[PDB]
């Protein structure tokens, strides 16, 4: 089974490159056009149009800026029927559900995608893609798609699901975490301590965070926030003290305040004596 990629903007290219070395006939197409030139040299048919691209292959992997564009690009096909559309655009679950219902109604199969990886990562161990939607579909493309990422996982029948998790992981968690470290290093610099001396500990802390993440997950699946050691109250105190120390250093410490606030709410709603994982119970705006 052969595949066509709509979009060559670094990712799509990487996607393509991986698929060719995996052992598959590949056909590309790009609205920017010239940017797909190199792919030919690799070993990929380029294509006049969307229409010819769609027509070339039974599996179509979209790789375009957003959903609006991908809607517009496969509007130009006339018939997309009996084809598999695999859209790896990041966006809302709503966007993914609308677009899935649309593909379904032009007699096409769908699978929504979300890519945890830098373009350069795609061949290698440091790469993961999640998919959601008709599981029948994922079953029919696993073998063809798993090769291009180290980790490839069907994460649920809701089309919007890979987008929820990509939001959660890349936004809610990842980006905030990356800001937290800015607050951190700014504090360290404001105490005229050398920021460099935070270098050797980085991997200890990320190693520690990972463990705890797994543990938080366990405690979210279970109801069990059994105290065990350091309680909500303990943490609210420690963080208040850190906030203050950060504030006195002349740092808005906004992430910390938000962390504190989250933690106090958990205590004030009477979770003060459970484990930290119980701060989850008070994150609804209510």
- Interface residue with its own copies among 76, 101, 120, 191 (CB under 8 A) is 191
Query: Residue 24: CA atoms inside 13 Å, Cβ hemisphere, count?
Result: 27
Residue 264 structure tokens: 């106090």
Query: Taking Cα atoms as reference points, which of 237, 238, 230, 239 lies closest to residue 275?
Result: 230
Phi then psi for residue 6, to 5 deg, are -95, 105
Which is closer to its own copies, CB of 139 or CB of 220?
Answer: 220
Residues 259-278 that bind its own copies (CB under 8 A): 259, 261-263, 276-277
Residues 92-111 that bind its own copies (CB under 8 A): 92-93
CB of 26 to its own copies, least distance (A): 25
d(Cα 90, Cα 113) in Å, to the nearest integer? 8
Among the listed ranges 77-85, 104-112, 246-254, 267-275, the one in contact with its own copies (CB under 8 A) is 246-254
* By the rule CB under 8 A, 205 interacts with its own copies: yes
Residues 155-184 that bind its own copies (CB under 8 A): 155-156, 158, 160-161, 164-165, 167-184
CB of 129 to its own copies, least distance (A): 10
Which residues are CB-neighbours of 282 under 8 A, at least 6 positions away? 262, 265, 266, 269, 271
Among the listed ranges 31-39, 42-50, 101-109, 247-255, the one in contact with its own copies (CB under 8 A) is 247-255
- Interface residue with its own copies among 1, 33, 254, 268 (CB under 8 A) is 254
d(Cα 55, Cα 80) in Å, to the nearest integer? 8
DSSP string, 131-193: EES-HHHHHHHHHHHGGGSSEEEE--SSTTHHHHHHHIIIIIIIIHHHHHHHHHHHHHHHTT-
* By the rule CB under 8 A, 232 interacts with its own copies: no
Query: Taking Cα atoms as reference points, which of 117, 34, 111, 103 lies closest to residue 75?
Result: 103
CB of 252 to its own copies, least distance (A): 5
Give the count of residues interacting with its own copies (CB under 8 A). 97
- Interface residue with its own copies among 2, 55, 257, 272 (CB under 8 A) is 257
Site string for its own copies, 125-154 (x = CB under 8 A): -xxx-x--------------------x-x-
Which is closer to its own copies, CB of 110 or CB of 235?
Answer: 235
CB 165 within 8 A of CB 112: no
CB 37 within 8 A of CB 61: no
* By the rule CB under 8 A, 188 interacts with its own copies: yes
């Amino acid at each position: 089974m052969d595949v066509s990629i709509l979009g060559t903007g670094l990712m799509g290219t990487a996607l393509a490159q991986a698929l060719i070395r995996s052992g598959t006939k590949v056909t590309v197409w790009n609205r920017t056009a010239d940017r797909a030139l190199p792919l030919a040299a690799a070993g990929a048919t380029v294509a006049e149009s969307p229409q010819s691209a769609i027509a070339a292959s039974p599996l179509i992997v979209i790789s375009l800026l957003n959903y609006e564009i991908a809607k517009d690009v496969v509007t130009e096909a006339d018939s997309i029927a009996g084809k598999i559309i695999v859209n790896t655009a990041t966006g809302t679950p709503e966007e993914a559900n609308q677009f899935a219902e649309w593909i379904a109604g032009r007699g096409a199969r769908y699978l929504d995608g979300a890519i945890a990886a830098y373009p350069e990562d795609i061949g290698t161990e440091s790469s993961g893609i999640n998919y959601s939607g008709d599981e029948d579909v994922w079953e029919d493309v696993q073998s063809l798609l798993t090769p291009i990422a180290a980790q490839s996982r069907y994460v649920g029948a809701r089309p919007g699901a890979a987008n929820v998790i990509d939001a959660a992981m890349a936004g809610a968690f990842f980006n905030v975490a990356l800001g937290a470290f800015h607050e951190a290093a700014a504090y360290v610099r404001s105490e005229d301590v050398a920021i460099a001396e935070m270098r050797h500990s980085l991997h200890l802390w990320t190693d520690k965070l990972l463990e705890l993440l797994h543990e938080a997950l366990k405690a979210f699946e279970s109801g069990e926030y059994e105290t065990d050691q350091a309680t909500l109250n303990v943490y609210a105190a420690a963080v208040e003290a850190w906030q203050q120390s950060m504030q006195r250093a002349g740092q808005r410490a906004a992430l910390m305040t938000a962390n504190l606030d989250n933690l106090q709410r958990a205590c004030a709603a009477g979770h003060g004596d459970k484990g930290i994982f119980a701060q989850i119970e008070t994150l609804s705006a209510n």
